[PDB]
Amino acid sequence: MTKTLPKDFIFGGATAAYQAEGATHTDGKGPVAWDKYLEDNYWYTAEPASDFYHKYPVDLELAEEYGVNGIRISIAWSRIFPTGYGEVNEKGVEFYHKLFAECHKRHVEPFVTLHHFDTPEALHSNGDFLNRENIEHFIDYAAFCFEEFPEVNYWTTFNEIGPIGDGQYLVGKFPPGIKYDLAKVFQSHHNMMVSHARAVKLYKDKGYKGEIGVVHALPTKYPYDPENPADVRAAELEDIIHNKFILDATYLGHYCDKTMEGVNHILAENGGELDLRDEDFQALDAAKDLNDFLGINYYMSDWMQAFDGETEIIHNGKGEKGSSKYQIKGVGRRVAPDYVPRTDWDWIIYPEGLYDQIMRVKNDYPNYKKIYITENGLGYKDEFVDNTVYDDGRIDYVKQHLEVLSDAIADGANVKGYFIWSLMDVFSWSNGYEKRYGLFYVDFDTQERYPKKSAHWYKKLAETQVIE
């Protein structure tokens, strides 16, 4: 009677290597830019995260125990290749084989992503993906993992290529920590996207019979006053930075005129030069109908109010309602409507924005084949009571999102799965171990797992495909 999900739907949980894993120095792991930024530029350190390095056994058991038939995991690049390129760290490759064995032992299909914010320190410093030399090292790493790991049927290149730009060269969040460098944001996108296109082409050529794809963060951008041509334009140009430039490269194998018209405008008003090449478009063009699936990482929508003035961005990493500021010259300013609910980090809780993006991708690019919601959830300071957590809050947010998932499907969108973030509690980039997102509460002091109320909820959802 209520919204109901496909029988064959995958009800998974997602995780990330450098957040869950642990053992940063333990067993051959090479360094990453995070190891320092968290220390000097922050307070808390990734050690011991959620001890996934040794605890995967309990987690996959619990996942299977509560109806989780899919799990997002990422191969820590620095683990396989300590420096980024060269001699393989036999110990690293081992762990990953053992991790997957448990996956199949447990009946939780692994969806593996290669790069998830962990570019090996050395390569990161040497330009990351703004240095074409590094594009090859990635191409090698991908090539390698493809050959080494036959257990994995689902592969993914990059997780959140847009945010990687947003955080490193625009909102200065992640290391390096640059600000307002839109030429870099666009450049980063082109280079990182080319890297993926070359991975996807190689996978197909080599013959592997699995499924390669991408995981894009797609926060819907709406004009503050739809009747306002300026604001409508504000959202046009805001969407072009975080979403359209990337999605184009992915499915058209080039950037259409609107995207260019706008990218040229941004860089006019903000200054910048871009290095785009025929070979990049030859590579991008060759892989536009090879992606097997599309990974949509949706959390919220933004409202843009076209407004002149100098550019300024204030990131709310501490969680202070309204401390967030964002304005870009030649674009507009984000302005959150008061009718719509917010969390302490100023993330809007707007489900329809999801459905809207699903339809946006579906109509703009038919060739998408299928969709997977590879990320979505709500993180706050959960309270441990009765050695559980009465997170009725989370259930409500996630439920609403799943409700419109039914709608998008019913209305033609080919969405085949959901991955709540995270499976169990993990370390947070901007918030440390305070922003709990998982279905299972991890007592970080004892690395214990206690299933929260959302787990038992999720189960009956997973085994009845009835949202209620």
Curated annotation (Swiss-Prot):
Induction: By lactose. The operon consists of lacABCDFEGX. Its EC number is 3.2.1.85. InterPro entries: 6P-beta-galactosidase (IPR005928), Glyco_hydro_1 (IPR001360), Glyco_hydro_1_AS (IPR018120), Glyco_hydro_1_N_CS (IPR033132), Glycoside_hydrolase_SF (IPR017853). It comes from the Bacteria. D-galactose 6-phosphate binds at Q19, H116, N159, E160, N297, S428, W429, K435, Y437. Pathway: Carbohydrate metabolism; lactose degradation; D-galactose 6-phosphate and beta-D-glucose from lactose 6-phosphate: step 1/1. GO terms for cellular component: cytosol. It catalyses: a 6-phospho-beta-D-galactoside + H2O = D-galactose 6-phosphate + an alcohol. The active site is at E160 (proton donor), E375 (nucleophile). GO terms for molecular function: 6-phospho-beta-galactosidase activity; beta-glucosidase activity. It is an enzyme of class 3 (hydrolase). This gene was sequenced from pMG820, a laboratory-derived deletion of the naturally occurring plasmid pLP712. This is 6-phospho-beta-galactosidase. It comes from Lactococcus lactis subsp. lactis (Streptococcus lactis).
